[PDB]
Scaffold this motif. Structure first.
Motif, short mmCIF file in Angstrom:
data_model
loop_
_atom_site.label_atom_id
_atom_site.label_comp_id
_atom_site.label_asym_id
_atom_site.label_seq_id
_atom_site.Cartn_x
_atom_site.Cartn_y
_atom_site.Cartn_z
N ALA A 118 0.82 -1.20 0.00
CA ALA A 118 0.00 0.00 0.00
C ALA A 118 0.88 1.29 0.00
N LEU A 119 2.05 1.25 0.64
CA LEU A 119 2.90 2.46 0.69
C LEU A 119 3.83 2.66 -0.49
N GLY A 120 3.65 1.88 -1.56
CA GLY A 120 4.52 2.07 -2.71
C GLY A 120 5.79 1.22 -2.78
N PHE A 121 5.94 0.23 -1.91
CA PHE A 121 7.16 -0.59 -2.06
C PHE A 121 6.78 -1.71 -2.95
N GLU A 122 7.82 -2.26 -3.55
CA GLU A 122 7.78 -3.41 -4.46
C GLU A 122 8.58 -4.56 -3.83
N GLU A 123 7.98 -5.74 -3.74
CA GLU A 123 8.70 -6.93 -3.26
C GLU A 123 9.81 -7.20 -4.28
N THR A 124 11.04 -7.43 -3.82
CA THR A 124 12.12 -7.69 -4.75
C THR A 124 12.46 -9.15 -4.71
N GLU A 125 12.78 -9.66 -3.53
CA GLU A 125 13.14 -11.06 -3.36
C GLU A 125 12.89 -11.60 -1.93
N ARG A 126 12.79 -12.92 -1.83
CA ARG A 126 12.61 -13.60 -0.55
C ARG A 126 13.95 -14.35 -0.34
N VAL A 127 14.45 -14.41 0.88
CA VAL A 127 15.68 -15.09 1.11
C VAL A 127 15.69 -15.71 2.48
N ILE A 128 16.53 -16.71 2.64
CA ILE A 128 16.73 -17.32 3.92
C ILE A 128 18.15 -16.85 4.34
N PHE A 129 18.31 -16.44 5.60
CA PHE A 129 19.58 -16.00 6.11
C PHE A 129 20.12 -17.06 7.00
#
Ligand SMILES: CC(C)(COP(=O)(O)OP(=O)(O)OC[C@H]1O[C@@H](n2cnc3c(N)ncnc32)[C@H](O)[C@@H]1OP(=O)(O)O)[C@@H](O)C(=O)NCCC(=O)NCCS
Ligand SMILES: CC(C)(COP(=O)(O)OP(=O)(O)OC[C@H]1O[C@@H](n2cnc3c(N)ncnc32)[C@H](O)[C@H]1OP(=O)(O)O)[C@@H](O)C(=O)NCCC(=O)NCCS
Lengths: 134, 153
Positions: A118-129
């Motif tokens: 809703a605030l204008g961010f775009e999901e880029t990637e999912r990762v496991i740390f």
């Protein structure tokens, strides 16, 4: 009523952080900043931020303003408080020279994900740390 | 002095002479970047004190590498700072499951510690099951899974 945190606010800030030492480093550091939302002189929400110089997943420029954490008391939710704290974080980042703002959240945090979109961010990637003590 | 080390497989810290082969391998880890960009990355790594890469040499030929950094930023899942982060690691298919990555990571770890890091960290995509088994088999613990977001500002 949004403000950049200073020593006075340290106390209120800890109570909320406890729900979501450092206040010290933040107050002292240049690459660090925290913002606070007040209702009748009480901090009812906060956002911690930092200027990152290392690699940031999904970003192609550097430095990056990173939303390290954000929390708004349950009862004050859905009134635009986070949108306001994030806009303050963005202003701060942008004039510390960051061309992009980044954040992260857990796959199970469905509301958070919706808030970021809703605030204008775009999901880029999912990762496991991972981590291993040396 | 009884057992010569790295007689055939040797881990070396990258220097200007490895640039071309490292790049040759890095294009296979990260497709989509011009030889330019790899080169610029290589020059940055070489001149910066918090950055280093390691090259696995089999009888003088690069067959794997690991890019590392001393991160001062917050690193997901760590309690201390700085952290020695494994930014990337790759081993030619024909040399996998022979302990190469093991040694590249041990060398990254060792460089990290000498630079003040109490923790080493890494990350990987949730589709990379082979990389997830590699991290676990090498003593790393999964700290958290996250979704990253970006907004231009
Ligand atoms: C995420 C959180 C900070 C949002 O705070 P907030 O004050 O409620 O958010 P805002 O009111 O400013 O909402 C911003 C936008 O997100 C949307 N949003 C907020 N809560 C939502 C919900 N529960 N479901 C769907 N959308 C939602 C709003 O509709 C709004 O939309 P709009 O911009 O289109 O009008 C809050 O839920 C919270 O503190 N949660 C616990 C901590 C956490 O999850 N932090 C996230 C990462 S550390
Ligand atoms: C991940 C990668 C670097 C591992 O390299 P490697 O040289 O084959 O790894 P090692 O031989 O040192 O293996 C060490 C550990 O992982 C295990 N392992 C390696 N490959 C495995 C596989 N395919 N399936 C299950 N376990 C595996 C080893 O058995 C284990 O050690 P142990 O036997 O002592 O318990 C390599 O597969 C690669 O380059 N993958 C493609 C690129 C990539 O995914 N990089 C990671 C993210 S940047």
């Amino acid at each position: 009523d949004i403000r950049q945190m200073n020593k006075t606010h340290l106390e209120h800030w800890r109570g909320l952080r406890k729900q979501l030492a450092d206040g010290e480093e933040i107050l002292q550091a240049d690459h660090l900043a925290s913002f606070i939302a007040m209702a009748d002189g009480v901090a009812i929400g906060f956002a911690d931020a930092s200027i990152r110089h290392d690699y940031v997943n999904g970003c192609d420029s550097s430095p990056v303003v990173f939303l390290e954490g954000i929390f708004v008391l349950p009862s004050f939710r859905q009134r635009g408080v986070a949108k306001q704290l994030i806009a303050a974080v963005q202003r701060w980042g942008t004039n510390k020279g960051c061309r992009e703002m980044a954040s992260d959240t857990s796959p199970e945090n469905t509301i958070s994900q919706k808030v970021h979109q809703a605030l204008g961010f775009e999901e880029t990637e999912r990762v496991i740390f991972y981590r291993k003590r040396c």
